Design a protein around this ligand. Structure first.
Ligand code: P5S
Ligand code: U6L
Lengths: 600, 58, 58, 117, 57
């Protein structure tokens, strides 16, 4: 039965197993028989033998393998997968690699263990997706992610069955993607992940030179560098960015070539592949500035090639286009304000245009229509605020044409919205570097939370006070509403204190009034010193960080606005004949020069 | 708050009208006490943590 | 009149003339919000570069 | 306010079989990097039977290292579990009960006639 | 920046102290587990809290 066999395997006794072998052969019952598999988990004898081992070696697994090859059911016995939701698809090879035992791993591989088996149980799903350990869903990924270089070397280089290290998950992740996924920012994790990433990339280059393992992309379309950028793994991202291979046989993998280096200064050609993509490929800059919400982005944009690339973009097409944008929008808004103010006072829509001033107003109106249709087409092909401003302009023009006199309301509302869109709701860099409203973080939606606590506190205090006021008719709730209004008037301005006429005891009323006023003043001081404290306390490293994020966002928006041909025209870097490639032709890859200084 | 409301109840049972005032004062403290519930909110947290009690005693 | 309402000595005789009260009210309340924000940022800068002077400085 | 010895006591592990009952952090299962550890909740959660280290830590500790000790994994995860299990529900129930009681008190004082003495 | 954790801990402990002792034990955290044999030889039934962690070294 199951319990006796499991106990015998656990204790490691071989005589009882050898005595049970004739029973197995006579009953024509294979180890894989449903009677011997655990019901809840689908577990077989062999994974149990692997789990409980003493001193690293026991004869139980070899005896089971001999028994299974004698019954001739070894191929099914080895690839028996766990079936419960907690452990789905796990194979004996996964457990053998798991327990850090190399000799069992090689024994199973020699016997014919499946090397591409995928374990996609809930235990193995990513930690976010209700999981525990996302090792890459593959035995080679399991060996790589558990820091077992010998197991990786054996699986990738063995005669019995060669592990295909270009294999992909059910999720599409490669072994490099798994290494990126398990990576953290601590020292030992980053250390061994980077070392094994280099090992695997070099090995894949050696085995079949043409393909680069980094070229294989996840089902989401993310390369290992892209995946590190999106997820926010600073260590592996940094290592991939400045990967330099000293070996001359495979130097195509390296990205940070060294042109020259005398003393501290190092002049390095950083490969710009997948960074300044120019629209042919997804850009690590785009993912980093837009998608990645991790605070590590602040450090992720701090790597030398990215920072220098952003600075070069700003120098080439960042400042000039930003100034053109702000000047053009301010001029358009000035024209809109002049048109709105100088709308003809007397008449019915539409209004005739007779004099030159009327023609100037019509020119302003058609300029407004141009801006509105431009924004409409830009968002439709979705900045919500610009879309609302454009649709308001369009409906205002429609009302003007149709004869409705309500054109003045929507048009002025669009005026206010357009002015606030440039000045108040800044998508990227502020119109003025020195801006009066730049420091505040208050929002129109947020203001309601600020006002609501005041309203509740005041209405509670007034509800307390009207009851004392009732003796003085006064008992009606209308008197309650009147005292609410009177108390709001009193707290906003002097009110002659007529209510003390109603009160029997004016001294307690005075005490309550003064304590309420001082409590309101203290609450105001707190809810306004919060912003002042953030202004004098949080600009130490955050102000420059948020400025860098805004500046990057503006640069990327301007960069995306350009057409493809002009985008390639303003491409940073230069073609470099970095070296002889494997095929025998020179390698031409876009590179960016970085003169990094390190003081020893 | 509870001492004030019991004092007001004792005055009301005694037949002293002054109870309303004492009773009213208690109610005021009851509204101030509700801020303990608002201690978590970030906006009024800094006010509910130490202002409402220590600052009220001072 | 606009300055008077910003200070507090204004009267809501402005709302009687306008054809569309609702949009006028919305614009005025937003204008008070932005004017309050401007004055608050002015006072924030004032206090910040006032406390920039410190005991060692003074 | 002694963080190091506090961490050592709350995470104590001893290997000797004779005196292995003094441990407080018992490993239960492991899978390569990940592993589950059962911390012992002795004086960390007494359910009011005796003083609880958490209560002394939040109230009685006046040191600046209170947040570091509250960040110790057993205490932090215990607080998170307490919040998850009944913290939010009971907090909102208390908020609603106070608010309704205060409204009732405001109404009863208001409608009070106070006719004469 | 640090007060919020402490204040939430205060909120939760007050709410948990407001409960009666039987209600306190009803919502206990963790489960009994047989950690091992004691000095006298009897198993130790200790209320334990499970925390999952990683070690890469
Ligand atoms: C008189 C010429 C009127 C041209 C109308 C075109 C126009 O105004 O488009 C305006 C747009 C870009 O402006 P924006 O998105 O508000 O930029 C500021 C940004 N939101 C920020 O906060 O920074 O797009 C432009 O700026 C269009 C550039 C046209 C250049 C003509 C010279
Ligand atoms: C050239 C100025 C400009 C106009 C419209 C949109 C943008 C960017 O927001 C594209 O997303 C820029």
């Amino acid at each position: 039965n199951r319990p006796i066999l499991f106990d015998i395997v656990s204790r490691g006794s071989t005589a009882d197993l050898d005595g049970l072998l004739p029973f197995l052969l006579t009953h024509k019952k294979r180890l894989t028989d449903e009677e011997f598999r655990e019901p809840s988990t689908g577990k077989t004898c062999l994974p149990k033998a692997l789990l409980n081992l003493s001193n690293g070696r026991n004869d139980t697994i070899p005896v089971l393998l001999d028994i299974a090859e004698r019954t001739g059911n070894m191929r099914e016995f080895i690839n028996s997968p766990f079936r419960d939701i907690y452990y789905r698809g796990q194979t004996a090879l996964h457990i053998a690699i798991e327990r850090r035992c190399k000799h069992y791993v090689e024994l199973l591989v020699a016997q014919g263990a499946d090397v591409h088996a995928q374990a996609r149980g809930r235990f193995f799903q990513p930690k976010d997706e209700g999981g525990y350990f996302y090792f890459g869903e593959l035995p080679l990924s399991l060996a790589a992610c558990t820091n077992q270089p010998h197991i990786v070397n054996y699986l990738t280089e063995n005669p019995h069955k060669k592990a295909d290290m270009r294999r992909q998950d059910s999720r599409g992740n490669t072994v490099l993607h798994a290494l990126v996924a398990i990576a953290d920012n601590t020292r030992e994790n980053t250390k061994f992940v980077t070392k094994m990433y280099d090992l695997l990339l070099l090995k894949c280059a050696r085995l079949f030179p043409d393909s680069n393992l980094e070229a294989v992309l996840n089902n989401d379309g993310l390369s290992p560098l892209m995946m590190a950028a999106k997820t926010g793994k600073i260590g592996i991202f940094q290592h991939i960015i400045r990967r330099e291979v000293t070996d001359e046989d495979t130097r195509h993998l390296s990205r940070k070539f060294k042109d020259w280096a005398y003393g501290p200064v190092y002049s390095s050609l950083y490969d710009l592949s997948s960074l300044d993509t120019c629209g042919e490929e997804a850009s690590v800059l785009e993912i980093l500035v837009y998608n990645s919400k991790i605070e590590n982005r602040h450090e992720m944009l701090a790597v030398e090639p990215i920072n220098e690339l952003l600075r070069d973009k700003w120098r080439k097409f960042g400042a000039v286009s930003f100034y053109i944008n702000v000047v053009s929008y301010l001029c358009a808004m000035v024209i809109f304000t002049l048109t709105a103010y100088y709308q003809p006072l007397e008449g019915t829509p539409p209004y005739p245009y007779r004099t030159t001033v009327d023609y100037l107003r019509l020119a302003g109106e058609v300029i407004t229509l141009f801006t509105g249709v431009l924004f409409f087409f830009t968002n439709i092909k979705f900045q919500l605020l610009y879309f609302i401003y454009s649709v308001l302009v369009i409906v205002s023009a429609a009302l003007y044409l149709a004869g409705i006199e309500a054109y003045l309301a929507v048009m002025v509302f669009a005026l206010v919205l357009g002015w606030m869109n440039a000045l108040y709701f800044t998508r990227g860099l502020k119109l003025t570097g020195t801006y009066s409203i730049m420091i505040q973080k208050i929002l129109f939606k947020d203001l309601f939370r600020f006002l609501l606590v005041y309203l509740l506190f005041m209405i509670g205090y007034a509800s307390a006070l009207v009851s004392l006021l009732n003796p003085c008719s006064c008992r009606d709730s209308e008197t309650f509403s009147t005292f609410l209004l009177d108390l709001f008037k009193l707290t906003i301005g002097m009110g002659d204190l007529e209510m003390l006429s109603s009160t029997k005891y004016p001294v307690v009323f005075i005490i309550l009034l003064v304590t309420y006023i001082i409590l309101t003043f203290v609450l105001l001081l707190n809810m306004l010193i919060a912003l002042m404290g953030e202004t004098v306390g949080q600009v130490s490293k955050e102000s420059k960080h948020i400025w860098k994020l805004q500046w990057a966002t503006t640069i990327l928006d301007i960069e995306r606005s350009f057409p493809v041909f002009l985008r390639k025209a303003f491409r940073s870097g230069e073609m470099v004949t970095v070296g002889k490639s494997s095929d025998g032709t020179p390698d031409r890859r876009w590179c960016f020069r970085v003169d990094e200084v390190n003081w020893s």
